[PDB]
Design an enzyme around this catalytic site. Structure first.
Site, PDB file in Angstrom:
ATOM      1  N   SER A 146      89.987  54.963  68.883  1.00  0.00           N
ATOM      2  CA  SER A 146      91.371  55.272  68.371  1.00  0.00           C
ATOM      3  C   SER A 146      91.778  56.844  68.704  1.00  0.00           C
ATOM      4  O   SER A 146      91.206  57.606  69.095  1.00  0.00           O
ATOM      5  CB  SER A 146      91.542  55.216  66.977  1.00  0.00           C
ATOM      6  N   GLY A 147      93.230  56.762  69.128  1.00  0.00           N
ATOM      7  CA  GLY A 147      93.802  57.979  69.522  1.00  0.00           C
ATOM      8  C   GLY A 147      94.016  58.063  71.016  1.00  0.00           C
ATOM      9  O   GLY A 147      94.815  58.716  71.614  1.00  0.00           O
TER      10      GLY A 147
ATOM     11  N   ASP B 200     101.420  56.314  63.464  1.00  0.00           N
ATOM     12  CA  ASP B 200     100.207  56.712  63.649  1.00  0.00           C
ATOM     13  C   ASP B 200     100.032  57.487  64.893  1.00  0.00           C
ATOM     14  O   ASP B 200      99.838  56.999  66.170  1.00  0.00           O
ATOM     15  CB  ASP B 200      99.310  55.509  63.634  1.00  0.00           C
TER      16      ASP B 200
ATOM     17  N   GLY C  11      85.759  54.582  67.634  1.00  0.00           N
ATOM     18  CA  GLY C  11      85.746  55.682  68.431  1.00  0.00           C
ATOM     19  C   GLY C  11      86.529  55.642  69.708  1.00  0.00           C
ATOM     20  O   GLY C  11      86.777  56.737  70.445  1.00  0.00           O
TER      21      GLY C  11
ATOM     22  N   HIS D 135      95.622  59.098  62.108  1.00  0.00           N
ATOM     23  CA  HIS D 135      94.466  58.707  61.235  1.00  0.00           C
ATOM     24  C   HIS D 135      93.365  59.460  61.634  1.00  0.00           C
ATOM     25  O   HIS D 135      92.325  59.539  60.851  1.00  0.00           O
ATOM     26  CB  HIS D 135      94.376  57.078  61.226  1.00  0.00           C
TER      27      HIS D 135
HETATM   28  C1  3Y4 Z   1      77.866  60.987  67.506  1.00  0.00           C
HETATM   29  O1  3Y4 Z   1      79.262  60.737  67.391  1.00  0.00           O
HETATM   30  C2  3Y4 Z   1      79.824  59.662  66.910  1.00  0.00           C
HETATM   31  O2  3Y4 Z   1      79.105  58.663  66.564  1.00  0.00           O
HETATM   32  N1  3Y4 Z   1      81.279  59.570  66.609  1.00  0.00           N
HETATM   33  C3  3Y4 Z   1      82.313  58.843  66.154  1.00  0.00           C
HETATM   34  C4  3Y4 Z   1      83.401  59.153  66.218  1.00  0.00           C
HETATM   35  C5  3Y4 Z   1      84.394  58.246  65.511  1.00  0.00           C
HETATM   36  C6  3Y4 Z   1      84.081  56.882  65.079  1.00  0.00           C
HETATM   37  C7  3Y4 Z   1      84.884  55.941  64.429  1.00  0.00           C
HETATM   38  N2  3Y4 Z   1      86.339  55.875  64.777  1.00  0.00           N
HETATM   39  C8  3Y4 Z   1      86.939  54.843  64.128  1.00  0.00           C
HETATM   40  C9  3Y4 Z   1      88.459  54.976  64.082  1.00  0.00           C
HETATM   41  C10 3Y4 Z   1      88.873  55.024  62.823  1.00  0.00           C
HETATM   42  C11 3Y4 Z   1      88.694  56.791  62.462  1.00  0.00           C
HETATM   43  C12 3Y4 Z   1      89.185  57.941  63.296  1.00  0.00           C
HETATM   44  C13 3Y4 Z   1      88.662  59.239  63.133  1.00  0.00           C
HETATM   45  C14 3Y4 Z   1      87.634  59.177  62.052  1.00  0.00           C
HETATM   46  C15 3Y4 Z   1      87.433  58.225  61.115  1.00  0.00           C
HETATM   47  C16 3Y4 Z   1      87.993  56.803  61.487  1.00  0.00           C
HETATM   48  N3  3Y4 Z   1      88.855  53.584  64.654  1.00  0.00           N
HETATM   49  C17 3Y4 Z   1      88.642  53.317  65.940  1.00  0.00           C
HETATM   50  O3  3Y4 Z   1      88.489  54.156  66.896  1.00  0.00           O
HETATM   51  C18 3Y4 Z   1      89.410  51.745  66.287  1.00  0.00           C
HETATM   52  C19 3Y4 Z   1      90.288  51.205  65.506  1.00  0.00           C
HETATM   53  C20 3Y4 Z   1      90.526  49.987  66.164  1.00  0.00           C
HETATM   54  C21 3Y4 Z   1      91.910  50.020  66.928  1.00  0.00           C
HETATM   55  C22 3Y4 Z   1      92.316  48.591  67.845  1.00  0.00           C
HETATM   56 CL1  3Y4 Z   1      93.571  48.785  68.685  1.00  0.00          CL
HETATM   57  C23 3Y4 Z   1      91.273  47.535  67.714  1.00  0.00           C
HETATM   58  C24 3Y4 Z   1      90.257  47.291  66.729  1.00  0.00           C
HETATM   59  C25 3Y4 Z   1      89.886  48.611  66.340  1.00  0.00           C
HETATM   60  N4  3Y4 Z   1      89.109  48.587  65.070  1.00  0.00           N
HETATM   61  C26 3Y4 Z   1      88.777  48.096  64.258  1.00  0.00           C
HETATM   62  N5  3Y4 Z   1      87.467  48.060  63.521  1.00  0.00           N
HETATM   63  N6  3Y4 Z   1      86.964  48.887  64.220  1.00  0.00           N
HETATM   64  N7  3Y4 Z   1      87.499  49.229  65.353  1.00  0.00           N
HETATM   65  N8  3Y4 Z   1      85.863  54.229  63.292  1.00  0.00           N
HETATM   66  C27 3Y4 Z   1      84.979  54.788  63.233  1.00  0.00           C
HETATM   67 CL2  3Y4 Z   1      83.563  54.228  62.611  1.00  0.00          CL
HETATM   68  C28 3Y4 Z   1      82.717  56.468  65.103  1.00  0.00           C
HETATM   69  C29 3Y4 Z   1      81.640  57.389  65.601  1.00  0.00           C
END
Ligand code: 3Y4
Length: 238
Positions: A188-189, A93, A186, A44
């Site tokens: 994830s992965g 995923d 942030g 994802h």
């Molecule tokens: C300055 O750099 C940044 O701000 N970078 C930055 C990079 C990535 C994210 C970010 N990452 C995620 C990405 C999905 C994604 C990736 C890549 C691109 C777009 C979406 N999800 C995640 O990291 C966490 C998902 C998750 C897993 C588990 Cl096991 C339990 C709960 C959750 N969550 C539910 N709701 N939130 N978290 N959601 C967000 Cl918003 C937010 C910020």
């Protein structure tokens, strides 16, 4: 990471920060070193990523502030997404990043062992989720890599927690019934690393959850043991 604490430098040497260059350079996702030219991460993470040319893998990082324009990174030669992947909530995923150059192993960067097929029956009691993700739903990427110890939850119990979803055996869940500790935006992965017989194993890949660290909402991870043959298929190609 919600309810975690600062990691110590060299504690999770397989942990990487995957950055995107488009439109500006920022942390995108976590990942794990599994081989000298291989990063295991979540499919994802690549939504809308049209080329591996915009990606930079940084290993041996504790603090995001260590990353400047003069910081060395690994370019990505290829993005390999599981061909059955549609969305995080439906499984598959998982993705591999084939690096343009080879990681030189040392005390700051080394691989984590994949689980063994025999280890499908082992009970992991020492599992940790790591990342630079948010500490709550509305937050920002953290400078210091965080860690949180989380208990593994059975598939039956995880399915009870996610009515309306299908929690398959290709998913593995982790969380406290009362919430409080989990992955968040942030993270994830990144890895869900479990220590067994003095050896760390990549048990899960941070995938999805309903909110972060909520009561009765375990984090859902790609169950790595169920993809060992797929990883070997892609990494051991003749
Ligand atoms: C300055 O750099 C940044 O701000 N970078 C930055 C990079 C990535 C994210 C970010 N990452 C995620 C990405 C999905 C994604 C990736 C890549 C691109 C777009 C979406 N999800 C995640 O990291 C966490 C998902 C998750 C897993 C588990 Cl096991 C339990 C709960 C959750 N969550 C539910 N709701 N939130 N978290 N959601 C967000 Cl918003 C937010 C910020």
């Amino acid at each position: 990471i919600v309810g975690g604490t600062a990691s110590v430098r060299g504690e999770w040497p397989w942990q990487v920060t995957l950055h995107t260059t488009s439109p500006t350079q920022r942390h995108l996702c976590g990942g794990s070193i599994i081989g000298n030219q291989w990063i295991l991460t979540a499919a994802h993470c690549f939504y809308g990523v049209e080329s591996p040319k915009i990606l930079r893998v940084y290993s041996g990082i504790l603090n995001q502030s260590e990353i400047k324009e003069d910081t060395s990174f690994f370019g990505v030669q290829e993005i390999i997404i599981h061909d059955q992947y549609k969305m995080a909530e439906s499984g598959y995923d998982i993705a591999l990043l084939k690096l343009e150059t080879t990681v030189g192993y040392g005390d700051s960067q080394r691989p984590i062992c994949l689980p063994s097929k025999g280890d499908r029956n082992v009970i992991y009691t020492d599992c940790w989720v790591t990342g630079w993700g948010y500490r709550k739903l509305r937050d920002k990427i953290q400078n210091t890599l965080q860690k949180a110890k989380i208990p593994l939850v059975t598939n039956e119990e995880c399915q009870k927690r996610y009515r309306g979803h299908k929690i398959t055996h290709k998913m593995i869940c982790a969380g406290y019934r009362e919430g409080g500790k989990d992955a968040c935006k942030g993270d994830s992965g990144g890895p869900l690393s479990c220590k067994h017989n003095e050896v760390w194993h990549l048990v899960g890949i941070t995938s999805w959850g309903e909110g972060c660290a909520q009561r009765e909402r375990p984090g859902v991870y790609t169950n790595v043991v169920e993809y060992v043959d797929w990883i070997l298929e892609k990494t051991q190609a003749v």
